[PDB]
């Protein structure tokens, strides 16, 4: 077996370690970011729940790293915390240094180098996490990417990770309207989230949501993590509640 250090290679010319990190995603919650010209939505699903769980005054799989860029989480949560904090630190370096907000491509690119660095160097784990990046820069507008646990990035207009990626992806690309709208993103996301999730009635206390818009309150970007009762409004439109 190859398991001892990450300084080795399996006969596929990859490492078994990378495969193990891959699988870590597909036992966590489901995550979907759909981009439109009029705003990008980020959505995540909770992988624990109780009625004595506080989840109505908090989120856990949704962090803003600067006031123009936000991330969703799928993977273990223990892995997540360390790398979020570093992305956010890198953003404020950018702000300090250049007097402006970071591009989406770099911020992701850095983070991807760092994951690969723990594969590359030492007997230290790969970090089995997939993050959905939804950002703005005034060079390529809205930008949706995701970052691999192997540590590479690929651009997008919609993507799903998490649990049942394949099932989710076919469903997203079917219903993708070509101009798209932020209101349709929001609508599509709930529908797609439902079928993967093992509950038949998706609910707002079981939902995390942020929508990013510059298409209303123009000339500036305002990113809003939704409050629980608003999430309830959008659920009522999709006819789930």
């Amino acid at each position: 077996r190859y398991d001892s250090r990450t300084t080795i290679f399996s006969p596929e010319g990859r490492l078994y370690q990378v495969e193990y990190a891959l699988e870590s995603i597909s036992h966590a919650g489901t995550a979907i970011g759909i981009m439109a010209s009029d705003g990008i939505v980020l959505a995540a699903e909770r992988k624990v729940t109780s009625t004595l769980l506080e989840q109505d005054t908090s989120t856990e799989k949704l962090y803003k790293l600067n006031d123009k860029i936000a991330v969703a989480v799928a993977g273990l949560t223990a892995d997540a915390e360390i790398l979020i904090n570093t992305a956010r630190i890198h953003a404020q370096n950018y702000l300090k240094t250049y007097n402006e907000d970071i591009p989406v491509e770099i911020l992701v690119r850095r983070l991807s180098d760092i994951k690969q660095g723990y594969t590359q160097h030492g007997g230290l784990r790969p970090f089995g996490v997939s993050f959905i990046y939804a950002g703005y820069d005034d060079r390529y507008g809205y930008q949706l990417y995701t970052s691999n646990p192997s540590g590479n990035y690929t651009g997008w207009k919609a993507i799903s990770v998490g649990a049942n990626t394949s099932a989710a992806q076919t469903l997203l690309q079917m219903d993708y309207k070509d101009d798209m709208k932020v209101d349709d993103a929001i609508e599509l996301a709930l529908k797609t989230l439902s079928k993967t999730t093992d509950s038949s009635a998706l609910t707002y206390d079981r939902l995390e949501f942020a929508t990013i818009r510059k298409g209303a309150n123009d000339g500036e970007v305002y990113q809003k993590i939704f409050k629980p009762q608003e999430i309830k409004d959008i659920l009522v439109k999709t006819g789930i509640t």
Partner: protein
């Protein structure tokens, strides 16, 4: 000794820099390059302390070129000017200084306006469309702004600059051996002869 001039016109930024370099009581050459292009549409004229201008100019030029090349699209004059200023601000708090004053005159393609910044040797980024440093700014803060018409063109600014130079030789005991005038526009950067 060692002057740098700047004017922002409404379609170009025009930087001028002396051709003269004096170490000791000796003028070493009457042709000396004392302005470098950071990228093909953003130009740094620079003047300042003995041989720090050379080390600092090449250090700054290389970094901007790396970031322009890295991003795969040249950075704004706004990104460029904080970075240069921040190197200087670290240095006076470090155990080795660089005290080099500079002007960034770029053509910003990002919002389509010419941009002249004034960056101090101290390391202070402030935007001014008539900035100037050392002993030049003692004469040209007033000369540019007296004749200054609120809209400007490349034609108008060049005759007014030539005039500025003509005052400096007269009231300083200095020799700048003329000045080279390189014009920063939306078509890149070019050299054009002047007094």
């Amino acid at each position: 000794m060692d002057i740098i001039l700047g004017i922002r016109v409404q379609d170009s930024v025009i930087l001028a820099s002396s051709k003269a370099v004096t170490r000791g009581i000796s003028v070493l050459k009457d042709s000396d390059d004392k302005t470098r292009q950071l990228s093909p549409h953003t130009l740094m004229s620079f003047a300042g302390e003995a041989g720090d201008t050379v080390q600092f100019a090449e250090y700054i030029q290389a970094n901007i070129q790396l970031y322009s090349i890295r991003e795969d699209y040249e950075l704004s004059p706004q990104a460029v000017s904080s970075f240069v200023r921040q190197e200087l601000a670290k240095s006076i708090r470090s155990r080795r200084p660089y005290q080099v004053n500079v002007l960034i005159g770029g053509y910003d393609k990002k919002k389509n306006k010419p941009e002249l910044y004034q960056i101090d040797y101290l390391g202070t980024k402030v935007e001014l469309p008539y900035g100037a440093h050392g002993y030049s700014g003692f004469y040209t803060f007033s000369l540019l702004d007296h004749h200054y018409r609120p809209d400007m063109t490349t034609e108008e600014g060049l005759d007014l600059l030539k005039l500025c130079v003509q005052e400096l030789e007269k009231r300083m005991p200095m020799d700048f051996k003329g000045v080279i005038v390189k014009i920063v526009d939306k078509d890149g950067i070019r050299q054009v002869d002047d007094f």
